Design a binder for this molecule. Sequence first.
Ligand SMILES: NC(=O)c1ccc[n+]([C@@H]2O[C@H](COP(=O)([O-])OP(=O)(O)OC[C@H]3O[C@@H](n4cnc5c(N)ncnc54)[C@H](OP(=O)(O)O)[C@@H]3O)[C@@H](O)[C@H]2O)c1
Ligand SMILES: NC(=O)c1ccc[n+]([C@@H]2O[C@H](COP(=O)([O-])OP(=O)(O)OC[C@H]3O[C@@H](n4cnc5c(N)ncnc54)[C@H](OP(=O)(O)O)[C@@H]3O)[C@@H](O)[C@H]2O)c1
Lengths: 413, 413
Amino acid sequence: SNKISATGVLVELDGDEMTRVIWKKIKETLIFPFVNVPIEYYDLSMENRDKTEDRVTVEAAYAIKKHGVGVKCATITPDEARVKEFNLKKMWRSPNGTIRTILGGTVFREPIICSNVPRLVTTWKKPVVIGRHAFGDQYSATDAVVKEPGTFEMRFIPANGGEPKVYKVFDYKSGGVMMGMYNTDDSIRDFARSCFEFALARKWPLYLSTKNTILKHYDGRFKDIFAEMYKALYETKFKTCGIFYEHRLIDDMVAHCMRSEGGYVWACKNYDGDVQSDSLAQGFGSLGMMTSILMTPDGKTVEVEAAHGTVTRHYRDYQKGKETSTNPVASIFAWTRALAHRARVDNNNTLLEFTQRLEDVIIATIEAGAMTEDLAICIKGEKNVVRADYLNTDEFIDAVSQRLKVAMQKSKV
Amino acid sequence: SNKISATGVLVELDGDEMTRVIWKKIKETLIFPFVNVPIEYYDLSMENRDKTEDRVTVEAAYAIKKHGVGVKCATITPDEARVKEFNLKKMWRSPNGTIRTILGGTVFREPIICSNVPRLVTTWKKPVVIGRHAFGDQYSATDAVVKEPGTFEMRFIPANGGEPKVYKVFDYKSGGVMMGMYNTDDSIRDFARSCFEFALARKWPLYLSTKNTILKHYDGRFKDIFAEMYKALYETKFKTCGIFYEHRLIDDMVAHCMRSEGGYVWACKNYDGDVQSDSLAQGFGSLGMMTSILMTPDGKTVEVEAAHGTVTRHYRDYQKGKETSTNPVASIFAWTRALAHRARVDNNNTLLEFTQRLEDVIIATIEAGAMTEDLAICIKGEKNVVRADYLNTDEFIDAVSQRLKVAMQKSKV
Ligand SMILES: NC(=O)c1ccc[n+]([C@@H]2O[C@H](COP(=O)([O-])OP(=O)(O)OC[C@H]3O[C@@H](n4cnc5c(N)ncnc54)[C@H](OP(=O)(O)O)[C@@H]3O)[C@@H](O)[C@H]2O)c1
Ligand SMILES: NC(=O)c1ccc[n+]([C@@H]2O[C@H](COP(=O)([O-])OP(=O)(O)OC[C@H]3O[C@@H](n4cnc5c(N)ncnc54)[C@H](OP(=O)(O)O)[C@@H]3O)[C@@H](O)[C@H]2O)c1
């Protein structure tokens, strides 16, 4: 007679702009009509993080750290332009900058994938997640220009005070630039732990990639850490759930992304992941089809969200009058996924089977020919798509809504 | 009523193993039967590079210098387990090493591209090159592990005596790794010129790919140098030849690669192309299908060669009895496309008519049904393919040969 409970708690973390509007729909149309929902709500609207001098976000972030599952962060990283927008006040940072430094750990981008929609590499029969390492490599690494002849040396000084090993690297004829780059073991190691826990949780196998050939120490340290930790802390369980861990050269792995079937996690280093996640954002479909999943290296904590932004370009119209067909599917797949790690964790098999439901029904809806405007450009033509069988945001969410209400039905009696 | 002559001299680099076989019949069947030519023959055969303590290759390398065109270098970079092979003398190094070192400048890889054999991304209706950097980025840029808590500093020391500069980049709470990197303008200025000079002759546009946003001084430096240079030393001549130069973020430029049609040269910095070329080795067609033009920054000297190695695997047999289907199109393109620049240089518009012929004919050849086994796995099915539709190494070369003989004639009357 009732709905679907859960003993755990999902931290809701509200947004603003166009995402906020759609946030109430999927919330109201797809989630609460079927799910009982113990929620610790944190409003992150620009208005409201301002009121809270400094922030809600530190609260909300830690809230997530208590509960282990969080959902939304539709951001606003304000500008100087923005304060001018609605009388904001001094500074503010970026909400996610705070959360990702609080929770710590690593983000993983899962495409939404559907038979009818055109991948720019047709090969992909399943989605490929990518784990990118954000601690300083060349992201925290200085680099100075050189305007005269001279010598650039690296010097390692111990904190006891030994022979403070020196490095004659290069004496300049004339002109140029220089750089230094650093990455500690507990950084590399933490990043590994995450991958292992997230691949283990998504039931899929794991691939590393680097270029240790021409960086024998730096990138040798990655190969090492992962492979020992695999055979130390995961190996058997990874064996248990039928899922290897194999390292390949980046050379091999950008090709393997190209040529392989898909359905695995891929670990790339800090640089590589910026390069190749912006690659697969155009490739697998559109922004509005990926999510973003911050997992912790303990593997006990998740913040899921849509990969695409707090889409203002549409918010103009909203009810300034004109219709808009912003893609909710990444916003829904925010919740479905979140609910899943809530489900998985609480053992709870019932919500899980339901998140599985909604997801499959959103796939089935698009492949079934009713889709948003954004995908209607991909399926055929930029210059020749009219409002034939593609829907409004709302009409679209209804189309699944009704399609889920039959899936609810047909399964049980 | 005669063959076709060239004015200026071409320089042959005859190599060893399986390639040096095909090189005869390619060079017999297709080349001199229609083509007068000045060559200056280097046998770079182990046996005949062994004799010389201090190699033939330094004279060949210096040959090509003077002549501005050069053709073969199908290598053998000898071995520990190779000196054993055939009573060698000690070490030798690799030619491809030596030569690039003298000649200088920048190697460029262009896919051989035909309709029936598939690109592993269907977009590519044309061939795309790559210019890698290669030297002193991370290539000469050493690194060590940091094995205990302590500080890693950088120091530029001049070579006049002014105040030195100094950076406390990072201190290690414990453990890890460190790495610095250095890259002079003259290098960049060489990488740019080569590119610019090389697009210029191909009639193809240019895109760079860097990450200056996230490496301000280091990667700003290139975004810069090509800009000035274009408008300083190229642009209007590009404008003239309907070509151009734009820059895109590395992020955008692996993504553009995927979605762009093809027919433009692209430069990625030393890392960014050591990654992305193995990618396209599987990605566009096969090894056996790329070639490899070193062009000097002066834009005045060229060494072309096949991608793939001096394919020892297939040679074992040769007459050890059994047939073979090593794919010669690269080795051939390595004549045609050398015969191309030679022409450009002599402004011999007539010969150029010829190099065109044999590239177009090999296109015809394959599309029409004739292929070697390597493509007989690529069109379809390693798990079922037989000798019906795939020519031998040498029946294939005759397949072209007949067809060029129709072309040569069935055009000119
Ligand atoms: N940590 C961060 O910095 C972060 C992360 C996420 C968001 N944000 C915030 O989001 C705000 C706006 O971001 P932005 O406009 O720069 O990036 P964005 O929100 O992703 O929008 C850029 C373009 O993406 C398309 N798009 C976005 N969501 C879509 C959807 N659901 N369906 C279809 N198309 C969609 C829109 O295309 P068309 O309208 O052209 O169809 C839009 O023009 C910013 O104020 C930013 O601070 C910040
Ligand atoms: N600068 C350098 O150091 C350099 C560069 C190039 C080559 N080499 C030298 O070349 C020698 C052999 O190297 P390698 O055999 O590892 O590389 P390779 O000559 O490219 O052959 C390796 C594999 O590639 C495939 N292959 C190569 N050419 C082909 C063609 N024309 N058609 C179809 N498939 C082809 C073969 O595949 P299947 O047999 O599996 O079909 C072969 O097993 C070595 O002595 C190496 O040092 C050196």
